Amino acid sequence: GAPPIMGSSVYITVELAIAVLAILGNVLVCWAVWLNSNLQNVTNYFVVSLAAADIAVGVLAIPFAITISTGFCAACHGCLFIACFVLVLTQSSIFSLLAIAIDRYIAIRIPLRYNGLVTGTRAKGIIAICWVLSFAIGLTPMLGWNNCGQPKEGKNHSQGCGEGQVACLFEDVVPMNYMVYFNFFACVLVPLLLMLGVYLRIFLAARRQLADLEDNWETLNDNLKVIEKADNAAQVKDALTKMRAAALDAQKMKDFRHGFDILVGQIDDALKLANEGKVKEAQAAAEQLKTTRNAYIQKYLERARSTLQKEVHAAKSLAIIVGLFALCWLPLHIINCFTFFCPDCSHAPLWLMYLAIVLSHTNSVVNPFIYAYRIREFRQTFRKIIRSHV
Ligand SMILES: CC(C)CCC[C@@H](C)[C@H]1CC[C@H]2[C@@H]3CC=C4C[C@@H](O)CC[C@]4(C)[C@H]3CC[C@]12C
Ligand SMILES: CC(C)CCC[C@@H](C)[C@H]1CC[C@H]2[C@@H]3CC=C4C[C@@H](O)CC[C@]4(C)[C@H]3CC[C@]12C
Ligand SMILES: CC(C)CCC[C@@H](C)[C@H]1CC[C@H]2[C@@H]3CC=C4C[C@@H](O)CC[C@]4(C)[C@H]3CC[C@]12C
Ligand SMILES: Nc1nc(NCCc2ccc(O)cc2)nc2nc(-c3ccco3)nn12
Ligand SMILES: CCCCCCCCC/C=C/CCCCCC(=O)OC[C@@H](O)CO
Ligand SMILES: CCCCCCCCC/C=C/CCCCCC(=O)OC[C@@H](O)CO
Ligand SMILES: CCCCCCCCC/C=C/CCCCCC(=O)OC[C@H](O)CO
Ligand SMILES: CCCCCCCCC/C=C\CCCCCC(=O)OC[C@@H](O)CO
Ligand SMILES: CCCCCCCCC/C=C\CCCCCC(=O)OC[C@@H](O)CO
Ligand SMILES: CCCCCCCCC/C=C\CCCCCC(=O)OC[C@@H](O)CO
Ligand SMILES: CCCCCCCCC/C=C\CCCCCC(=O)OC[C@@H](O)CO
Ligand SMILES: CCCCCCCCC/C=C\CCCCCC(=O)OC[C@@H](O)CO
Ligand code: NA
Numbered sequence: 195g196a197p198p199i200m201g202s203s204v205y206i207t208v209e210l211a212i213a214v215l216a217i218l219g220n221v222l223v224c225w226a227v228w229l230n231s232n233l234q235n236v237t238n239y240f241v242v243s244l245a246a247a248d249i250a251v252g253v254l255a256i257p258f259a260i261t262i263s264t265g266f267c268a269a270c271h272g273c274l275f276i277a278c279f280v281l282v283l284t285q286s287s288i289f290s291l292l293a294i295a296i297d298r299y300i301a302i303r304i305p306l307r308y309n310g311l312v313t314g315t316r317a318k319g320i321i322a323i324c325w326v327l328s329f330a331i332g333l334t335p336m337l338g339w340n341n342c343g344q345p346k347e348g349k350n351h352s353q354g355c356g357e358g359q360v361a362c363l364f365e366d367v368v369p370m371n372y373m374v375y376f377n378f379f380a381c382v383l384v385p386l387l388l389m390l391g392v393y394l395r396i397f398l399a400a401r402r403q404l405a406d407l408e409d410n411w412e413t414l415n416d417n418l419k420v421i422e423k424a425d426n427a428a429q430v431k432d433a434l435t436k437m438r439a440a441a442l443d444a445q446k447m448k449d450f451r452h453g454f455d456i457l458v459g460q461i462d463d464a465l466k467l468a469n470e471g472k473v474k475e476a477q478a479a480a481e482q483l484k485t486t487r488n489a490y491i492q493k494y495l496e497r498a499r500s501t502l503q504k505e506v507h508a509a510k511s512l513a514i515i516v517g518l519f520a521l522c523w524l525p526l527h528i529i530n531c532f533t534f535f536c537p538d539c540s541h542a543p544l545w546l547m548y549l550a551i552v553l554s555h556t557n558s559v560v561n562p563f564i565y566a567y568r569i570r571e572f573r574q575t576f577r578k579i580i581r582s583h584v
Contacts, residue, residue, distance in 0.1 A: 205548050206260055212555050213252035219562030220245040226575040233571055236317045237297050241565075243321045244290040247283045248558035255280040256555055263548075265363045267355035270342035273362035274335050281377060282332030284523070288385045289324035291516050293317075295392040298509050302399045302502075331381055339372050370534040378527045386520055393513045400506045404499065411495050413440040414487065421464075421480045430468040430476045434461055437483075444494075453490030460486060511568035515561055522557035525550040 223245040227233045258276045268276070301308050342360070349361040360367065413436060420433040438461050445454045460483050468476040529542050529550055565572040 201545070202263070205263065205552070208552055209256050209260055209555065212552065212559060213256040216248050216252035216256075216555070216558035219559055220248040222576060222579060223562050223565060223572075224249075225579055226572055229579070230571065230575045233575065236312050236314060237294060239314065239317045239321065240290045240293045240297065243325075244287055244561065247286045247290070248561060250283055251280070251555060251558040255283055259551060259555070262362055262364055265349070265353060265361040267350075267353050267359045268362040269358050270340070270345070270360050270367060271336060273360060273367050274340055274342070275333070276362065277364050277368055278333050278335055280332075282328045285332050285381060286325055286328040287519065288382060289328060290321075291519065292385050292389055292392075293320060293324070294512055295389045295396075295516075298505070298512065299392050299396050299399075302396050302403070302505055302509075331377075334376065335368055335372055339369060339376075341367055341369055365533070370530060373527075373530045374534045378530065382523070382527065386516065389516050393509060393516075396509050397506065400502050400509075404502050407444070407495060407498055407502075410440050410444045411491075413437065414491065418480070418483065421477050424477065425473070427468050427471045427473045427476065430473065430480070431465065434465045434468060434476075434480065437461055438465070449490075450494060453486065453494070457483065457486045457491065508569075511564065514568070515564050518560050518564070519557055522560075523554050526554050 224242055227238050227242055258279055262273070262276050297312055300312055304311075345360050346366055349363070349366065350359065353361045355361060417433045417437050417440075421430050424430050424433070438458060441454060441458055441461065445451075460479070464476045464479040464483075467479055529547065532539055533541060566576050567573070
């Protein structure tokens with residue numbers, strides 16, 4: 195078998211290339227938010243926390259991955275920290291992603307209460323607590339859920355380790371039942387299934403609210419034709435009461451409230467001539483609603499449609515970032531399951547283990563590109579930053 199150093203050199207060179215890109219791209223995300231007040235909403239504070247975690251992957255997690263790949267002699271508990279510190283950063287990324295899903299769900303479901311409920315100070319508090327839980331969760335093995343009490347005395351005497359030390363290797367010190375049940379199933383897979391369900395409810399809601407609009411818009415228009423072609427005062431009365439209720443459930447910013455007070459006011463005039471029995475004077479009064487609909491109502495339809503379509507396109511960009519996290523991290527998780535559940539399977543080869551590790555660390559590079567390709571405000575700020583400074 196070849197000198198371990200040769201394949202070892204490839205792995206290191208690759209891991210360092212990844213760390214450079216992780217730092218640069220996510221530093222540029224942070225610079226952008228710092229610089230552009232349009233980017234300084236509550237959602238993007240979570241985006242920033244996510245970015246700071248991806249920077250820390252290049253600054254610390256990747257240097258740790260290189261170290262533990264050597265099996266150098268180390269005191270067990272210090273070896274656990276080198277091995278698990280990435281689990282803290284990964285857990286903080288999940289919390290951050292989960293908070294974004296909820297933040298956007300609160301914006302689609304209750305737009306009118308969003309600003310008083312999701313504030314910057316509350317977000318700061320959430321981010322501060324999620325980082326505290328991430329250290330707790332990601333370093334649980336250090337509290338005694340570890341194989342430190344079972345040292346591999348073959349490996350440790352070969353390496354020449356001393357009194358208290360172990361050959362520092364991930365699968366030798368981190369119990370695989372912590373990795374599968376606690377880290378994967380509970381702390382990664384369940385949160386990602388939640389985010390899946392949140393983003394589903396976001397899209398149903400926007401799809402619901404949209405059809406409610408288009409369905410309110412035809413209620414307004416259809417009932418016009420009823421009036422136009424009626425012959426007794428009563429058909430008009432029945433047709434008008436439907437628009438009125440439709441015009442207020444749509445109503446459910448002083449130009450918008452003047453437009454609908456022109457509209458309902460007209461409806462309430464045609465409803466009075468109808469109730470009085472004047473049939474033609476009610477059809478002609480109800481024809482004055484065309485002027486209001488062309489001047490005011492169509493314009494709330496098109497504007498209410500844009501904001502909903504813009505929320506959908508925005509939640510789709512954020513759903514992609516949750517997909518890439520999963521795409522990138524599931525291989526390393528799925529191999530742990532095989533190692534743990536299939537004792538009669540051969541262990542996955544070394545080359546695949548470090549290919550799945552390298553894959554997991556590339557997730558720290560992709561988010562900056564997603565923002566740039568999918569978010570105008572981020573792309574335009576990236577260009578200003580680059581164009582000017584470099
Ligand atoms: C503030 C940031 C940037 C720097 C953090 C310092 C890091 C690199 C320090 C903090 C604790 C340190 C570890 C603590 C204990 C041990 C056990 C010893 O037998 C080998 C070294 C080892 C494994 C250390 C490696 C370096 C280490 C991980
Ligand atoms: C993107 C995510 C969701 C999909 C990743 C699935 C990958 C990691 C799967 C697909 C096929 C799998 C392999 C299939 C069979 C074996 C042989 C066994 O003796 C060791 C594990 C090993 C080598 C598996 C490891 C995990 C594996 C490589
Ligand atoms: C699709 C993703 C997002 C969720 C499901 C991922 C995990 C939990 C699933 C996907 C495929 C599964 C593996 C498929 C095959 C086997 C071989 C068997 O002898 C032991 C269990 C084991 C190793 C399974 C463990 C759980 C597993 C790794
Ligand atoms: N199973 C595993 N191994 C390693 N590194 C050890 C690679 C190895 C594997 C086998 C061997 O004989 C010698 C070394 N890092 C690992 N990281 C993870 C992981 C991190 C987050 C989720 O899973 N799993 N994981
Ligand atoms: C945040 C600002 C920038 C921080 C930059 C430095 C961060 C630390 C990066 C490196 C960490 C790797 C730790 C290596 C430990 C190696 C070690 O113990 O070597 C000696 C070993 O032989 C003990 O037997
Ligand atoms: C779209 C999903 C694709 C997965 C994500 C990217 C790649 C992740 C890492 C691994 C993927 C598949 C690896 C297949 C080959 C594994 C292999 O060589 O098995 C060796 C086997 O003989 C061990 O006994
Ligand atoms: C998923 C988003 C877009 C990025 C795609 C993933 C790219 C990551 C794949 C990287 C491949 C190079 C792998 C590392 C080189 C070292 C290696 O494979 O094995 C090193 C060993 O010691 C060999 O036994
Ligand atoms: C190893 C540590 C990782 C690197 C640090 C990553 C943080 C990225 C910093 C980018 C933006 C947030 C900090 C704002 C700094 C403001 C500054 O430098 O000048 C002040 C001026 O721009 C204010 O008008
Ligand atoms: C022993 C290794 C070093 C230990 C100390 C490293 C501390 C953890 C490293 C990673 C991330 C630090 C957390 C920073 C979060 C900053 C953040 O996003 O704040 C700004 C955000 O709230 C927007 O307003
Ligand atoms: C700009 C952010 C700062 C990045 C971190 C600066 C310091 C670390 C630089 C990069 C990689 C560390 C590589 C060495 C890790 C392993 C090591 O030193 O020894 C392991 C083993 O051979 C000991 O016997
Ligand atoms: C998806 C939400 C539920 C929790 C997270 C995912 C876990 C369930 C999905 C698939 C598989 C995990 C359950 C164990 C399957 C393997 C098993 O039976 O082990 C075989 C046994 O003979 C080994 O001792
Ligand atoms: C969006 C990402 C999610 C995509 C789906 C992820 C889950 C896919 C799981 C991948 C493979 C499971 C099937 C492989 C079975 C291997 C097997 O039976 O090996 C036989 C054993 O004797 C090897 O020695
Ligand atoms: Na991450």
